[PDB]
């Protein structure tokens, strides 16, 4: 069942190891700590960073990273998955790598000394120590570990350094298989709007009795139809890399769907679907975004319900504003600051109106995280820069509209998934959003 990819896992533990020095703060070494695993929080930097190496969260599993080798601490049977591997990376990098295995134990001492001796190797590399500083886990391991780790900074003059920013930048280029996971997640999330707008319709024609959380719920629960999923390896199995077949069994939600009908609306990156009536009119926003073999991907549209024509006018211009990011702006060596203002420029040229309602971003690098908040496209960023093999979500929005003569309240939005390719920005989200087509009239 799990099998990792040691050429993966070889090429990107030594990018990690060539890149973690230059790292802000000039750190010493690494320290990366899983406990048990929360699958209420996917996205913290030690699960990332996991699923980056292995392919896999590895629970209750130290990984510490030196210039000269790597210290894995991790249970026998885990083991059972990396010893052939890494033997056979050892004796390739006999002279200037070494990964050891130690091997924890429940036996009460064991770990302790095992972070004894590893807390010896940090301090002997150096007094900063990188770290994932904003990440939780429980559990007896990751508690010992700690009560190691406060003293050690107690005892020695060890100085904790984030690696936030330097773990973006290190896995944001998208290698060949990354990006046809990427696709594959992507055309999940195409089918899951396609459910969604299907639903909707069918909720607004009906005149039922329903909330916004509701229905995105409904749409929610399709996903644990099993069999409906291995229903899609048609579309989904030639989008996998080569000698690869679509598995139900690593598709998954980026998220829980958002629906929003109004007449109140929120764009904000915490929003949730509205707790209130589907209102069968004017403007409703729907967002899903799918992960496959922990891969995000996002797609948001706006259906229309009998739209004013300051709605489809301004539903229009939203189609023409996605295309220039996606095909004039979402540039190699682009900040998202020249993005971002970009975005500003176009709106400020052709609808003034919309300047104020305009979501303050206009999405993020997406990958293994779904929102890389070292990576937004806002004015504020100006020290990043793309890169082909960087995906984003390109997102954009506009709140507290109203239509000038019947005072109905609005929003607008519209994401897709994109990909940097040599041969330019590549759309992996291909849901329609011609407006003739999310249009619906009763």
Request: aromatic fraction near 10%; include cysteine; charge should be negative.
């Amino acid at each position: 069942e799990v099998i990792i990819d040691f050429s993966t896992f070889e090429n990107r533990l030594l990018a990690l190891r060539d890149r973690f020095p230059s790292f802000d703060g000039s750190p010493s070494s690494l320290v990366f700590i899983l406990g048990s695993a929360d699958e209420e929080n996917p996205y913290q930097k030690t699960t990332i960073l996991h699923n980056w190496l292995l392919g896999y969260e590895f629970p209750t599993t130290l990984i510490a990273v030196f210039k000269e080798g790597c210290v894995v601490i991790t249970s026998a049977a885990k083991t059972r998955y990396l010893e052939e591997g890494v033997a056979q990376m050892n004796k390739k990098l006999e002279n200037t790598f070494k990964i050891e295995l130690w091997q924890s134990s429940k036996e009460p001492g064991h770990n302790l000394k095992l972070f004894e001796d590893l807390v010896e190797r940090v301090r002997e590399a150096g007094s900063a120590v990188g770290l994932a500083t904003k990440d939780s886990y429980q559990g007896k391991f990751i508690t010992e570990w700690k009560g190691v780790w406060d003293t050690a900074v107690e005892k020695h003059g060890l100085n904790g350094v984030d690696v936030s920013l330097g773990l973006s930048s290190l896995w944001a280029v998208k290698d060949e298989k990354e990006q046809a996971y990427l696709q594959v997640s992507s055309r999940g999330s195409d089918k899951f709007m396609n459910l969604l707008s299907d639903e909707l319709v069918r909720a607004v024609d009906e005149e039922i009795k329903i909330t916004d959380a509701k229905l995105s719920d409904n749409v929610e629960n399709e996903i644990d139809k099993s069999r409906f999923l291995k229903k899609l390896s048609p579309e989904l199995t030639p989008l996998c890399p080569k000698g690869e077949k679509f598995d139900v069994n690593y598709l998954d939600w980026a998220y829980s769907p958002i629906i929003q009908s109004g007449p109140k609306y929120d764009l904000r990156v915490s929003a949730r679907s509205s707790e209130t009536q589907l209102d069968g009119n004017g403007c409703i926003l729907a967002s899903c975004g799918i992960r496959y073999k922990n891969y995000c991907s996002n797609i948001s549209r706006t259906f229309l319900i009998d739209p004013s024509d300051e709605m489809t006018d301004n539903y229009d211009f939203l189609l023409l504003l996605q295309e220039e990011i996606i095909n004039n702006l979402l540039r190699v060596g682009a900040t998202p600051k020249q993005i971002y203002d970009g975005a500003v420029n176009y709106i400020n040229s052709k609808k003034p109106e919309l300047s104020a309602g305009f979501t303050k971003n206009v999405g993020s690098l997406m990958g293994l995280e779904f929102r890389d908040s070292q990576f937004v496209l806002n004015n504020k960023n100006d020290y990043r820069k793309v890169e082909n093999g960087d995906c984003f979500n390109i997102s954009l929005g506009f709140n507290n509209l109203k239509d000038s003569k019947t005072g109905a309240s609005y929003a607008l939005q519209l994401a897709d998934t994109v990909q940097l390719t040599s041969g330019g920005p590549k759309v992996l989200t291909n849901y329609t959003k011609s407006r003739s087509q999310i249009s619906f009239y009763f």
